[PDB]
Amino acid sequence: KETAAAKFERQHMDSSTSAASSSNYCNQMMKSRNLTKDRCKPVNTFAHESLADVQAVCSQKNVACKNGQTNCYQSYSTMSITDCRETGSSKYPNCAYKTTQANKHIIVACEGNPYVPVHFDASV
Ligand SMILES: [Cl-]
Ligand SMILES: [Cl-]
Ligand SMILES: [Cl-]
Ligand SMILES: [Cl-]
């Protein structure tokens, strides 16, 4: 079974590029990160910062999660991220995604030792 730390890294990390280069970024990344295997994952967000910078968020501004938990952390500075969401024509096994790139603060839930991000809550 995939660990909660590695699951976040597979779903929400993309340090290779600075930003989403094209509209086909999500269609390629959702397939490459195995998020369209048996079901097209409706909403997923990739971060375009180094692994150390996203892991550093857990020791930053402590905020409440959307569900009610107190282990979420908002980043101090705005980070380059891309939100991938299914379009109207998206239907398995032909998953289609909308690519939207913007610079925002990231909010991530952190747990364990070392204290690393496991869930991507939202972006502000
Ligand atoms: Cl791990
Ligand atoms: Cl997400
Ligand atoms: Cl680590
Ligand atoms: Cl998540």
Q: If DSSP states are collapsed to H, E and C, what string results for 76-103? A: CCCEEEEEEEECCCCECCECCEEEEEEE
* CATH at residue 3: 3.10.130.10
Inter-residue contact 83 to 123 (CB < 8 Å)? yes
Using only the alpha carbons of the chain, give its radius of gyration.
14
Identify how the structure was determined.
X-ray
Cα dihedral sign for 102, 123, 95, 1?
positive
12 is catalytic: yes
Tokens found for residue 91: 């239907």
Q: Work out the number of other CB atoms within 10 angstroms of the CB of residue 27.
A: 19
The C-alpha atoms of residue 73 and residue 22 are separated, in whole angstroms, by: 30
In units of Å, what resolution does this entry have?
Answer: 1.6
Catalytic-labelled residue, pool 33, 48, 105, 119: 119
Phi, psi of 9 (to 5 degrees): -65, -35
Cα(108) to ligand 1 centroid in Å equals 16
- Structurally, the chain folds into a number of domains equal to 1
Show the domain range for 29: 1-124
The C-alpha atoms of residue 99 and residue 81 are separated, in whole angstroms, by: 10
Inter-residue contact 46 to 13 (CB < 8 Å)? yes
Residue 42 labeled ligand binder:
yes
The C-alpha atoms of residue 70 and residue 67 are separated, in whole angstroms, by: 9
Cα(122) to ligand 2 centroid in Å equals 7
